[PDB]
């Protein structure tokens, strides 16, 4: 089967910037390649077919080039609506195969996360579980680290994280971290801490509480 290796997986750029995405075919495929866009919550749409031909209605800021194994897709001046995903596809031979996609993200000024910690709700403490939640909100750039501590001891087991896509309004990222314990284990310990490491500070942002303290 023909493997289509698409790079980069993601790239950050400014409004107005020119960017180039590449697609490498594992064997020569002439100009038998297409490029698609996909907006959040929408189906893919054809932009380019036969390596270089623009689909009907597609703006001329989108272009494709190449023949053989190395293909390029270019956006000459990024507009707000263009910070979405793009895929290449070969139709030289069955099985038809797609590249892994590229997501374009918008650059903005660095922003430190706003960190909030939440003890288990009184309602949850009626279950067999207790969840401690930490929100790390409205930060930039996207890379961030969270560490949990219980009574000063680093805790990996029972931690699950979720990351938003880039915010359409302010171009920031947010992250939720949930530490789930049994209620019995929760009540065996006193201090619960969420520590956020981000490039905006050499020191982590630390939010903590002590159980059954007010």
């Amino acid at each position: 089967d023909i493997q289509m290796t698409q790079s980069p997986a993601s790239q950050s750029a400014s409004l107005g910037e020119s960017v180039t995405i590449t697609c490498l075919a594992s064997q020569t495929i002439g100009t038998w390649l297409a490029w698609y866009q996909q907006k959040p919550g929408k189906s893919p749409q054809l932009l380019i077919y036969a390596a270089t031909s623009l689909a009907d209605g597609v703006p001329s800021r989108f272009s494709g080039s190449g023949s053989g194994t190395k293909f390029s897709f270019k956006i000459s001046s990024l507009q707000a609506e263009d910070f979405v995903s793009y895929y290449c596809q070969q139709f030289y031979s069955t099985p038809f195969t797609f590249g892994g996609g590229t997501k374009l993200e918008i650059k903005r000024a660095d922003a430190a996360p706003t960190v909030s910690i939440f003890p288990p709700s009184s309602e949850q403490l009626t279950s067999g579980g207790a969840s401690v939640v930490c929100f790390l909100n409205n930060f930039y750039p996207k890379d961030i680290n969270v560490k949990w501590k219980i009574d000063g001891s680093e805790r990996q087991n029972g931690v699950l994280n979720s990351w938003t896509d880039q915010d359409s309004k302010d171009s920031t990222y947010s992250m939720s971290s949930t530490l789930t314990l049994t209620k019995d284990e929760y009540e065996r310990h006193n201090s619960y801490t969420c520590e956020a490491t981000h490039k905006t500070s050499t020191s982590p942002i630390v939010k903590s509480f002590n159980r059954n303290e007010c």
Binding site: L46, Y49, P95, F98, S121, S131, V133
Partner: protein, 221 residues
């Protein structure tokens, strides 16, 4: 306008069967080669099957060969995908696509979702997340809602029945031990809460459950 409308998706157990349909309009259906293309939860695109304009020739990747059958009824302007022996890795959004002279995909439908899972339908617990008890309050306050232990996706989550939309982040669900968990945060000026009501509204259609959880301050004891 070219129109492709898929239907027939749903939640199916491994080993099960499902038949998808695609209603085509706004072009001469019988003139075009058609494919099904799927998009996995990881957002990978995978070609599933192709059928010639006249229906006489069909093509499949090895991943679905012997399990899936593409067909078409040119008189009814409909494309079909019969799925059998379904596997977890068949979980995807399935799109109907019209080809050009060659197999680029010129037009795509909106998709129909197929989920292959043995997991049992489970209603979530919904927990209000108020700030730490007796915390010193700054200029803004962040509240949350934890939606724990549901299957299948999705849930809908709003704040104040959708009237509170600014300063809201709803985090993608994470799957653990056949159950999803999601959370949402909302940030307001400290002069608005708790003086004004903030409620999390969660619906889980698959379990016919709907719950409202008002965020109340922790305490007073």
């Amino acid at each position: 306008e070219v129109q492709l409308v898929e239907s027939g998706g749903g939640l199916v157990k491994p080993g099960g069967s499902l038949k998808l349909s695609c209603a085509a309009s706004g072009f001469t259906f019988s003139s075009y080669d058609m494919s099904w293309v799927r998009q996995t939860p990881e957002k990978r695109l995978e070609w599933v099957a192709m059928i010639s304009s006249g229906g006489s020739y069909s093509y499949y990747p090895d991943s679905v060969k012997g399990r899936f059958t593409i067909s078409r009824d040119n008189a009814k302007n409909t494309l079909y995908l019969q799925m059998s022996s379904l596997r977890s890795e068949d979980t995807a959004m399935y799109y109907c696509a019209r080809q050009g002279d060659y197999a680029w995909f010129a037009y795509w439908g909106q998709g129909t979702l197929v989920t292959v899972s043995a997991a049992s339908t489970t209603a979530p617990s919904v927990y209000p997340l108020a700030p730490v008890c007796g915390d010193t309050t700054g200029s803004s306050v962040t509240l949350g809602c934890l939606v724990k232990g549901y299957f299948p996706e999705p849930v809908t989550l709003t704040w104040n029945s959708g009237s509170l939309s600014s300063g809201v982040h709803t985090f993608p669900a994470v799957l653990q031990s056949d159950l999803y968990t999601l959370s949402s945060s909302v940030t307001t000026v400290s002069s608005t809460w708790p003086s004004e009501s903030i409620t999390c509204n969660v619906a889980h259609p698959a379990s016919s459950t709907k719950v409202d959880k008002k965020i109340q301050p922790r305490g007073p004891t």
